Symmetry: C2
Subunit: 281 residues, 2 copies
């Protein structure tokens, strides 16, 4: 059975999808603000599930997960969500955590709370790692600044208008990708407005964690990301001791949409890099 | 776990959510075109789960269910989806099947294939029972007509305009209904465009089933439904020997959205009445 749920520390049910090879390295996918476990694209999901035990999570308040009334500003709830998924799957080591945008912050809340015992590597895709004034890891782009707080309203007129401030930032050039462009706008619309707001009504700084991670981390980030400034990825690269970076020239916030083959290729190479094969060649 | 899946006759996974007491009467909820198990609204789903073993299904191609390339024009697939969910839950008798819009057609496909041995009653909410030219039980309204083929387009601009306009017939007001309006619109947009098209590109008639049905069926339909014309429900009421009906004056296609309390009440009473 592919679709499952785990109960976090506050009693929130967190829905997730497990696909791929049972024997393979666990790859946990954490999506971004006002999206879902369906954002990644069918081709990306199919390709990653070939080698990995693929675990695609619906963040609290998103997708099919429970939407509690409060607690979105508590790092311990986010941490408990990832811990609970990992435990339900019996994952105690070697996991790869991948986070898009807000997913990066979820990973950091989790690593801040549990350390790196269960984890061999992480991938930060157009990710924030902090939120708040002066947080270089939390630097948003112009599109996101026009989109908020109108994108948080329950008023459809305002929410539709505001979310169009994103333009094509999620997809890049949208030709031939209309279904995906529709679906991404859709997930944001069906994310409860109160959840959309609660996610950014918080502050947390994680630079001290970044400087002390003992795991390899790939920073994968569009140079033209108008949602999360590429400066945030560059900051993570600068602070993380075992960082690797791939900056996609001309790419916006959705590299997995703009070039699903390249995205899969870069993630597979990263994960394979964590063994002893590179040493051999 | 509340969230689950069942494997249909063609290998399609059908995701569904179970809530409420496992000893209650099973109530299967089957949503409409381009929607999902989340359409019904939190209060409606909480109130129904207070009394029933609530089974909220994502149709094939919708929500989190698999989306096969083809087969949406084959009644035996839809029938297997419903059988597979029932089997997975151990329901062999006494189920209530509730169908919103296209969900009515899914129910009829299932009943024709399988009979009513597992089923005590049905509810047809703004429902079609047939589809295609000349089927009085598939009579579509002005909002549905205007929405095609824009709502089937790969092109975002075209689909967003068509489905945005379409969504207003689902909510009615929409003053007071902003979040649901957004969410219904979002579920339609996130439904793959090829699935939106596939569902519509078929023909099947069930008048012979309806006039022969051996279960009580409630017809619950807005008089100003502009998605599925009220005449479709008036037609089903006429054919079904043990029909009951409730025509909500001034209501469009979404009664559970327009008046969640009334919707739950009318459903409870019908189900209670099965005695």
């Amino acid at each position: 059975m592919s679709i499952r749920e785990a109960v976090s520390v506050d009693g929130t049910s967190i829905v997730y999808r497990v696909t791929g090879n049972s024997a393979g390295t666990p790859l946990v996918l954490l999506h971004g603000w006002a999206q879902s476990s369906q954002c990644w694209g069918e081709q990306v999901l199919a390709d990653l599930a070939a080698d990995y035990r693929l675990i695609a999570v619906d963040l609290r308040g998103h997708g099919y997960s429970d939407a509690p009334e409060s607690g979105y500003d508590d790092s311990a709830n986010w941490a408990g969500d990832v811990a609970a998924v990992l435990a339900a799957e019996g994952v105690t080591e070697n996991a790869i955590l991948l986070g898009w945008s807000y997913g990066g912050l979820v990973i950091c809340d989790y690593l801040a709370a549990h350390g790196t015992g269960a984890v061999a590597g992480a991938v930060l895709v157009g990710a924030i790692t902090s939120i708040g004034r002066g947080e270089k890891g939390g630097k948003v782009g112009s599109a996101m600044r026009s989109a908020v707080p109108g994108a948080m309203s329950e008023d459809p007129r305002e929410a539709i208008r505001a979310l169009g401030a994103f333009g094509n930032a999620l997809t890049g050039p949208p030709e031939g990708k209309g279904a995906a462009s529709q679906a991404l706008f859709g997930y944001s619309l069906s994310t409860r407005p109160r959840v959309r707001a609660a996610l950014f009504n918080r502050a947390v700084g994680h630079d001290e964690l970044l400087r002390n991670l003992d795991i390899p981390v790939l920073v994968l980030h569009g140079t033209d990301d108008s949602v999360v400034d590429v400066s945030a990825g560059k900051h993570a690269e600068e602070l993380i001791p075992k960082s690797q970076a791939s900056y996609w020239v001309g790419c916006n916030h959705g590299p997995f949409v703009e070039d699903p083959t390249r995205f899969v290729s870069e993630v597979r190479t990263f994960i394979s890099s964590l063994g002893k094969l590179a040493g051999a060649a």
